[PDB]
Design a protein around this nucleic acid. Structure first.
Ligand SMILES: [Mg+2]
Ligand SMILES: [Mg+2]
Ligand SMILES: [Mg+2]
Ligand SMILES: [Mg+2]
Ligand SMILES: [Mg+2]
Lengths: 79, 260, 192, 144, 96
RNA sequence: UGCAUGCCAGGGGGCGUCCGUGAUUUUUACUGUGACUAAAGAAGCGUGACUAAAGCAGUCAUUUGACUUGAAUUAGAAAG
RNA sequence: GCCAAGCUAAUACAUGAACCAACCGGGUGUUCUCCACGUGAGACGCCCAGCGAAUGAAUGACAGUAAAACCAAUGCCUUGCAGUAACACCCAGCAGUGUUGACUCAAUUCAUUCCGUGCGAAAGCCGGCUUGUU
């Protein structure tokens, strides 16, 4: 059944003494579970970092255009 | 493709003797061109003499003891070209690869907070997907959001540790440059004018500190500061000043006799 | 095999070239697709660099564009009626780029009713069932644009002439554009 | 939108440009849609290319052909091909041993767009382009 | 601090001028201006009246929309001062 | 994050940059400079590998190392 | 040089990951709430909106002259135009500005298409400690 350890039921062969037991593959441990979940967290963090980087760049572009708009308006007002 | 490099075909700046062996370390593709690079194995063995042969060079390099641009490199065929910061933490060396007045590769010793700064020449600008401006540098770096005033030919001073751009130096007349190719390689001068020839090669006319005028193609210049008195990077001892051959020979004879 | 090199060609002097190298894979050619009208049948071709071309052998559906409306629709190919290379390609129903084909006009007629509220034939789109926000939108669109007379006669008959824009032997697709303007009149004369 | 131009359409296939939709940025002086670009190297686009009816897929001003590489000068030698001309480049070659020159010439096949109409003996400026035929590697850019 | 208040969202194409005054019932509003950007500028009578108007309107639902209100730095007397300067050149423009 | 914008005024000329329109439009050879251009080989600077053909090394203190060592410069047709 | 039958792996092969999780657009409903007696406004519902590829449409600039009226719509000013990037809220500057000597190029928006001949976080491995459903 699920939620049951499988290492206990692994077939062991003895030679004449060594008990030969195969290594269990696809045994997802809590260590492996944390490793898998970290990959998804890193991926979503990366795209959010680039989205924040795009926002800052767009702010710089817009602010520079705004400053030039404010410069000539003040010059026209002082004209 | 070609995997080998004959020693006679290797660049002369590597200073490999023609009688020592048939082959030279073939530089792998990477940040710098094969003809304009200095392989890590050459640096650790022939330049620094930390390794007596290639076997000890691989032992040092494959351990990750050598850092280029704040990142360990385990490959002795790594290009490691111009204006690269090479540091060995186990010994604390921290030099930068530059050109002397002869055009040979020079290991300019760096200090703390100077090994964090690298100068990159912008060779191409393009728009990536999502309307993202990207600048390609001379060492193969792609900057995802360069300064809006950046143009091809300008140089970006870059923080290798922080992985971000700190300032921009524009390619204009009156700025200090260093020649990275041709017969004038390693000379430092100030831009006087740029002869623009569409389709052909643009010609830059420069003048050094002494006052000598020399020219080169615009692709061989590398802006390094606002003017000759203000350089953002430390240059080798000669300060990019080419000396007369007759004068240099006499000085060496006088100095040699003075020592003895 | 098939080569695209100039070694076998005569020089401009008429002299023969003495070839001193064997044929190279980098200069190969391949057999033509000769794509015909029929149910879809393609064969991938592994090309230089590991990329794949789609050598279409039979095609009877394509994505055809109405340039003036700036839209496109997937329609079935009814016939091929003109080919500039030779009428033999028309006789065999060969699909190549720039060949004149007849396509189903029903999807374009359906979109015309949805966009402008006009029934050309007067499934069957009910224009009277549209919301009053849509009928008001029909008035704005109708005033600026009038349909071309030559296009409307084709749409009533059920088939409209079009020109193939894709290369079936290279991409495996049979995309095209509806003939309009002087181009439509040019080919109408050729087809009697 | 427009009627068929008989003087231009005599090719068994409809002649048209591929950069613009002619039966709809690039509007000529006669109020027609006609693609025309500006080539670099300080060469002016001829008025016929700007305001003309001809269709040429190999013209450097109204097609996708681009000019890059060498820019040469020559004299028109033959004008018997359709849209192609032969030019001559006469030069003196130096023989070192005799310290003297000899006259030499080369012949090049050049595509000529229907905007120049050169005559035998005229002198032209040509620019390098992609191979357009077996022997054509140059396009006429100017007629002097 | 100030007598002006910023009010949004006020959808002009869907409301009349008197319709938006209903939310201003009980207050003596001198000048009220409606804008294309779905907001309204209202000049009240006293700073205390404006202040007490924004501690009970922020978040309230008006005409099917939650209202966002805040004190505005615009001043009523500056509008009258600039208007005459604009008004004289309107008549001065006729003189050219 | 308006955390921004301006603070001698003026006219008048001097320029940089890009585009448009205009000279009844001037090149080529030669020659002077400059640019670009792998080594090996050739020429050549320096250097007692015991000399030399070579090589690009080594030298000097006596040191837990100096020389911020050296390995310079040329020619290399024609065409571009 | 070779069959046939029995086992058993994967970073071989195949399959497959909703919520967490955004910004932005297009097409629509005989949907409702308001304004005017329709270049109306706003909610909600539905259909789609990733990289790359295909066809079509549009962008990829400007740079050869100085002022007035009139109509319609809409901005503001007040109850007639001074003057002002643009935008009908939730972003009051979240690109009005790619590059080249030159592009049908880079990149963006819209419509439709991709059918095996594309696109996993290899459903992978190993280390340290503090030993950790971040
Ligand atoms: Mg495993
Ligand atoms: Mg080029
Ligand atoms: Mg695999
Ligand atoms: Mg542009
Ligand atoms: Mg452009």
């Amino acid at each position: 059944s699920r939620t049951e350890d499988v290492r206990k039921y692994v077939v062991r062969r003895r030679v004449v003494d060594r008990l030969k037991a195969p290594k269990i593959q696809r045994l997802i441990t809590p260590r492996v579970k944390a490793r898998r979940a970290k990959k998804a967290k890193d991926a979503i963090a990366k795209v959010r970092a680039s989205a924040a980087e795009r926002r800052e760049y767009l702010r710089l572009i817009a602010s520079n255009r705004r400053a030039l708009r404010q410069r000539d308006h003040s010059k026209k007002h002082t004209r | 493709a070609k995997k080998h490099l004959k020693r006679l075909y290797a660049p002369k700046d590597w200073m490999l003797s023609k009688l020592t062996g048939v082959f030279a370390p073939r530089p792998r593709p990477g940040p710098h061109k094969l003809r304009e690079c200095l392989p890590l194995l050459v640096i650790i063995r022939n330049r620094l003499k930390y390794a007596l042969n290639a076997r000890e060079g691989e032992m040092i390099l494959r351990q990750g003891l050598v850092h280029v641009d704040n990142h360990p490199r385990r490959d002795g065929k790594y290009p490691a070209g111009f204006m690269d910061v090479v540091e060995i933490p186990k010994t604390g060396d921290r030099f930068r690869l530059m050109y002397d007045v002869k055009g040979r590769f020079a290991l300019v010793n760096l200090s703390e907070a100077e090994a964090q700064i690298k100068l990159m020449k912008v060779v191409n600008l393009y728009t990536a997907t999502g309307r993202v401006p990207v600048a390609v540098t001379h060492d193969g770096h792609r900057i995802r959001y360069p300064d809006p005033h950046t143009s091809i030919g300008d140089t970006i001073v870059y923080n290798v540790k922080e992985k971000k751009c700190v300032d921009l130096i524009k390619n204009r007349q009156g700025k200090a440059v260093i020649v990275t190719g041709g017969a004038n390689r390693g000379r430092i001068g100030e831009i006087v004018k740029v002869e623009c020839h569409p389709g052909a090669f643009n010609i830059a006319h420069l003048k050094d500190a002494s006052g000598a005028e020399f020219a080169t193609r615009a692709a061989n210049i590398f802006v390094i500061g606002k003017d000759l008195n203000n350089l953002q990077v430390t240059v080798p001892k000669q300060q990019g000043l080419r000396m007369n051959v007759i004068q240099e020979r006499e000085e060496r004879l006088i100095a040699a006799e003075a020592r003895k | 095999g098939i080569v695209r090199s100039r070694l076998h060609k005569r020089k401009i002097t008429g002299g023969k070239t003495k070839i001193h190298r064997k044929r190279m894979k980098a200069e190969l050619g391949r057999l033509p697709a000769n794509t015909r009208l029929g149910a879809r049948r393609v064969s991938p071709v592994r090309a230089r660099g590991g990329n794949f071309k789609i050598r279409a052998l039979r095609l009877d559906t394509g994505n055809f564009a109405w340039a003036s409306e700036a839209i496109a629709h997937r329609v079935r190919l009814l016939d091929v009626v003109y080919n500039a290379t030779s009428n033999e390609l028309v006789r065999t129903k060969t699909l190549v780029k720039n060949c004149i084909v007849a396509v189903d006009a029903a999807p374009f007629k359906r979109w015309y009713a949805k966009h402008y509220g006009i029934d050309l034939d007067a499934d069957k789109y009910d224009v009277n069932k549209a919301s009053p926000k849509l009928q008001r939108e029909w008035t704005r669109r109708r005033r600026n644009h009038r349909v071309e007379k030559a296009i409307a006669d084709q749409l009533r008959e059920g088939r409209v002439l079009a020109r193939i824009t894709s290369r079936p032997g290279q991409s495996g697709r049979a995309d095209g554009i509806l003939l309009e303007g002087a181009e439509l009149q040019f080919y109408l004369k050729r087809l009697e | 939108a427009h009627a068929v131009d008989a003087t231009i359409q005599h090719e068994k296939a409809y002649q048209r440009q591929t950069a613009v939709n002619e039966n709809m940025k690039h509007v000529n002086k006669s109020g027609h849609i006609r693609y025309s670009k500006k080539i670099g190297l300080g060469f002016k686009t001829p008025a016929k290319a700007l305001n003309g009816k001809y269709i040429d897929r190999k013209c450097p001003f109204t097609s996708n052909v681009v000019i890059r590489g060498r820019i040469l000068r020559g004299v028109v030698h033959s004008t018997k091909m359709h849209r192609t001309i032969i030019i001559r480049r006469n030069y003196l070659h130096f023989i070192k041993k005799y310290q003297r020159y000899q006259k030499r010439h080369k012949s090049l096949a050049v595509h000529c767009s229907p905007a120049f109409d050169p005559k035998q003996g005229d002198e032209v400026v040509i620019g390098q382009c992609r191979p357009l035929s077996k022997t054509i590697r140059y396009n006429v850019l100017e007629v002097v | 601090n100030s007598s002006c208040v910023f009010v949004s969202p006020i959808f002009r194409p869907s409301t009349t001028k008197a319709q938006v005054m209903e939310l201003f019932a009980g207050v003596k509003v001198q000048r009220l201006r409606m804008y294309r950007q779905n907001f309204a500028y209202a000049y009240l009578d006293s700073p205390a009246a404006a202040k007490k108007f924004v501690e009970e309107k922020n978040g309230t639902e008006f005409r099917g929309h939650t209202l966002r209100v805040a004190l505005s730095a615009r001043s009523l007397e500056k509008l009258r001062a600039r208007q005459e300067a604009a008004n004289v050149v309107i008549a001065a423009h006729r003189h050219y």
